[PDB]
Amino acid sequence: GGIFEALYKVLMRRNSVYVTFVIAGAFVGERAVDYGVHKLWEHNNVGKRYEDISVLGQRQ
């Protein structure tokens, strides 16, 4: 339980640092979730992408 007083110990007894944490925490979270949707997608669909076309370079 000692991380709960220590995380309030440092940052928000102030109101501009706080607005850093909700803006900058909106980014690491948006990139943590865009990364996991973009790897559950290319694992359900193997052999179905555009770069998996066996005759791609050669039309002639």
């Binding site: 102030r14 501009s16 607005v19 850093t20 980014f27």
Partner: peptide, 29 residues
């Protein structure tokens, strides 16, 4: 006074690093 100075500065460095947080977007870090 002098608190409201610096307390103007802490969230004046929020805009800078909050509009430096919606357009150009180095995103690995």
């Amino acid at each position: 006074i002098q608190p409201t100075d610096v307390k103007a500065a802490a969230m004046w460095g929020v805009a800078a690093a909050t509009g430096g947080l919606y357009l150009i977007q180095p995103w690995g870090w």
